[PDB]
Amino acid sequence: PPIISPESFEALRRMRAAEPTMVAERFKQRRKRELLGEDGKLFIVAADHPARGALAVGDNETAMANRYELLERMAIALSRPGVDGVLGTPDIIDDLAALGLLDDKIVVGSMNRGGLRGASFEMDDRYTGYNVSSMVDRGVDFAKTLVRINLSDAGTAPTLEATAHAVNEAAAAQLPIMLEPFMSNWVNGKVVNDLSTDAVIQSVAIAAGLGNDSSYTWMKLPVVEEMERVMESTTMPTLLLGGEGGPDATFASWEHALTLPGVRGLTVGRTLLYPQDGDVAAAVDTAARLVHTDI
C-alpha cells in the first residue's frame, strides 16, 4: 500500500498553486527533534541528485526522472523505523514537508548544484540551492555541500572559496554543515572521482580547512579501501555515502567502516532508493538496522 495516496498528491499540487503560503507554514509547524539520538548515530536518506542533472542509477533517463515515484520511494524510506531524516534540495523538502512527512525527522539541505553532470563547467559547482538564511528561517537541521577538488580545473578555485563562505555562515548560525569532498580528474572528457585511499585522505585535509570556524563541520565520505586509515584523517563527525551501487558486499563494507573512530552513521541515496531489485522497504531496513542496532 502506497504511503502517498493520489489524493494527497492532488492536495500537494493544488497547494503549491493556490495556497503557497501553506508550504512554509506546514514546514514551521513541523515537530522537531534533537540532532543525535540516544545511540548518537544518524541515518539519512539522500535525494538531491536530480537538481544536479543526475537522474541515473543503472537506468539513465527513468529513475528519479519521475518525481512522484521519487517522493513515494522517499515516503517509504521515511516510514521505516531507524531513518532519522532526509537530505534534499528545496523542491524535494517542500513537497515532503507539505505532505506532512517530516515530523520528528532530520532535514538536511543541499546548498550547491551548479556543477551539472556532464557540463564543461561542472567543477565550477556554484551555490544554487539552500543557503544558511533560508535554512535557519525554515528550521532545517543540517546543511550539506559537494566539494569536488579538480587540480587541473580552474573552476575548483571559486568552489573552494564559496564553500569556505558557506561554512562561515553555517558556523556563525550554529548550523551543522556536512561537506562531501573528493579529488576529481578529467578523464576522456568526463569527471571521475579518485576513490584511492590517499586521494580521499587528501580531500579531507583540504575540506576540513575550509571556513573561518570548523566547529560545526561534518564529513560525508565514500567507503574506500583501507578506511581506518582514511578515518585517521580527521577528528570530525563522519557520515558514509553509498555511491554507484555495484549488494551484500556493499552492506558489509559499510558495517565495517561503521565501527571506525568518528563515524556517526549513513547518508545514502541511490542505493537505498531504487535498489537493484524491487524492494525499497527491505533495503532501507538493512541499512537502518546497521546504523541503529536497536540496543
Closest approach of a second copy to the CB of residue 50, in Å: 4
Q: Is 153 in the site for a second copy (CB under 8 A)?
A: yes
- Our CB check for a second copy shows the closer of 29 and 174 to be 174
Closest approach of a second copy to the CB of residue 31, in Å: 20
- Our CB check for a second copy shows the closer of 34 and 277 to be 34
Identify residues 193-222 at the interface with a second copy (CB under 8 A). Answer: 198, 201-202, 205-206, 208-218
- Residue choice 63, 149, 284, 290 for contact with a second copy (CB under 8 A): 149
Closest approach of a second copy to the CB of residue 162, in Å: 10
Q: Is 276 in the site for a second copy (CB under 8 A)?
A: no
- Residue choice 5, 28, 53, 100 for contact with a second copy (CB under 8 A): 53
Closest approach of a second copy to the CB of residue 74, in Å: 12
Q: Is 131 in the site for a second copy (CB under 8 A)?
A: yes
Residue 107: phi, psi to the nearest 5?
Answer: -105, 120
Task: Tell me the per-residue interface mask from 233 to 252 with a second copy, x by CB under 8 A, - otherwise.
Answer: xxxxx---------------
- Our CB check for a second copy shows the closer of 198 and 285 to be 198
* Inter-residue contact 160 to 110 (CB < 8 Å): no
- Our CB check for a second copy shows the closer of 243 and 262 to be 262
